[PDB]
Design a protein around this nucleic acid. Structure first.
Lengths: 161, 161, 161, 161
DNA sequence: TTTTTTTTT
DNA sequence: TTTTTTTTT
DNA sequence: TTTTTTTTT
DNA sequence: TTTTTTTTT
């Protein structure tokens, strides 16, 4: 069965959620197993419609790859990164939706800003959710993501008993 | 069944103990599972009534959240933090008991001081337990807490087999 | 059964793959178990025959030992290392094939270069596969290898239940 | 059953071995479980009687506690520590055997020196085994010991399923 | 005994 | 296919 | 719902 | 064979 144990951070404008999506495996005819669809750390964003009350309907997703996770956890305090995703890459309708996730340190050094930009040329929409992440919150993420990385990679299958 | 494997540090005035409290889950009707009550790292303090002989009766608890754990493990040597808790928040009798946990580096750099303050306006009591933590002891905590963080978050449920 | 969950990095000239090989154990007559053949992190390299299309036939392997893994993960940004292996050491045909793996930081600091040299004096061949590894990619490796190290050592057998 | 998966380092004068000893638990009448005898990282030393040929008969043991492990893994490159143990503390024959383990960085910075001193006033013996540990070897230890620490503490018993 | 709360499947 | 070897239970 | 793809067993 | 001990459920 599925499991819902998100690490969620709520702030002024929007809320931020993070939970792993494990890899899918195919059992070969030879008996062994082969990783098929790679796992990710799924990031979800949604806005606040009212004093601490958020709109789950207007949520946007962003799937961190193994490498991108590696990038995030290796970030020094004075570091910043930006990831660009096309949800429908290699599909009939590519270049129509563009997603970009950005992590930038804030001036104070009291953590980072993490914002998701989603531009949809099909629906003519332009969404952006920014969420402030303290040092401690980003620390949970770094440690949690470090823990999950081997799993989303399927390396937890390698075990002596 | 339950499990009692505390990491305990004993010192002059008081003693310090730390062990995880796992999250509670509810099995949905849909089959999947959902994290309900979040896990914590439970901290217990108690005084010394006599030459190395402590009073377990006068113990006070403090429950570290995921974020607070993230804060503790991310602490540089020259860092200090303070957490404030109301045990009965959102309850009939709030603001009546106040707890504060403080981690401050000591002058020497030979670790930290960790003290729990508990002010009870109902019972008119004022308790404070301070415990010195060497670099090595705080190292156990940092590593142990890092290990436990994924578990108290319920991320150990995400596993390939 | 076996498991195939490689961490693969594809680049211009060649491709790089990494996955653990667990240790083999023998069950003693006394009942206990004893680690026999030590585990490794297996590295595979292969060339590119055409615009992003690689030759799996011309692959070369390199097996990182526990210690060598320890070396790799302890590398600062400004560090470089080189490992020399004779595949047929202590065998009839030693000194006939020589392998060397090198990790050097690139000028920019944007990661490392990792190249495998294989000199075969029996077949009169001289192969070399170089692959550029970004900071994020090497971060995956560092974290993945850290996770796997206890397992290839067989220390995952030590567990309370 | 027991498990033998030592991390061993062999050098000129002596050899060094390290493997965890898990904690013992007692099942309470209440149903739960309680950690009884604490786990350790067991260190074994033995001399070399001949060109790369060691004397397993003249081995000496040293049991690292949780805290001492915490100390070892927190060591910077320029750090050194010394631990003193009386094997028969709180026993009929205390003060008769004294053990001391020392970790000192070597001049070059190419790792550390680790030596075990055992003075026996009952048998009138004075033993000392020194073993050089490269940066990579000590890296294996740091990572392996970090992995094992939660287990020797019995914190691996805390798990969601 | 424990600072709660915010959104789904 | 893989750099081995050293000491026990 | 999710940026894909490249090579085996 | 191993530095112990301190307080509960």
């Amino acid at each position: 069965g599925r499991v819902f144990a998100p690490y969620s951070v709520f702030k002024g404008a929007a809320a931020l959620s993070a939970e792993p999506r494990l890899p899918t495996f195919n059992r070969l005819d030879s008996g062994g197993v082969k990783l098929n669809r790679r796992g990710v750390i799924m990031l979800t964003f949604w806005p606040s419609v009212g004093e601490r009350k958020y709109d789950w309907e207007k949520r946007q997703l962003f799937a961190l790859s193994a490498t991108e996770v590696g990038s995030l956890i290796s970030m020094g305090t004075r570091d910043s990164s930006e990831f660009f995703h096309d949800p429908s890459m290699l599909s009939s309708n590519a270049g129509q939706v563009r997603k970009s996730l950005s992590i930038k340190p804030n001036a104070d050094g009291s953590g980072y800003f993490i914002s998701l930009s989603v531009v949809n040329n099909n629906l003519k929409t332009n969404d952006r959710f920014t969420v402030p992440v303290t040092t401690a919150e980003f620390a949970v993420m770094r440690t949690a993501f470090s823990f999950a990385l081997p799993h989303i990679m399927g390396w937890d299958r390698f075990t002596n008993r």
